[PDB]
């Protein structure tokens, strides 16, 4: 790790600096806060992976 292990939506590739920064200065939300409570492999829904969700839906 170069930077804290956190969902990457929290990072922005900086202008003029080779480095990333956090789009909320220094606050950090852990992975657990992206998913529903107790989500298997933090997942929108536990039944399937992204592709599984797609083709089940189709």
């Amino acid at each position: 790790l170069v930077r804290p292990d956190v969902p990457e939506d929290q990072y922005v590739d900086s202008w003029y600096i080779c480095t990333s920064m956090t789009h909320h200065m220094g606050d950090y939300r852990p992975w657990s806060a992206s998913a529903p409570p107790n989500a298997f492999r933090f997942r929108p829904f536990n039944e399937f992976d992204a592709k599984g969700r797609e083709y089940v839906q189709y």
Binding site: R3, S14, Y16, I17, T19, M21, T22, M25, G26
Partner: protein, 74 residues
Amino acid sequence: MFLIHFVHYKTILQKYTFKFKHIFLSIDKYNSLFFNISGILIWLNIIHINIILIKYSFFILINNFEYLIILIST
């Protein structure tokens, strides 16, 4: 002619209050966010680095006006 001598009543009652703000109460100022500066880099002719506090820097400013300056975790 004068028929009388009397004592001068007056009603001085202020019962209404009108206060109007003078203009300069609403004039602008320059306000700033303020964080603790962890470090500074200056470069114009020759680069110079000052490090006040070494931590992982969560924010970085770059400012070009006279000298190139970079305020770290500023």
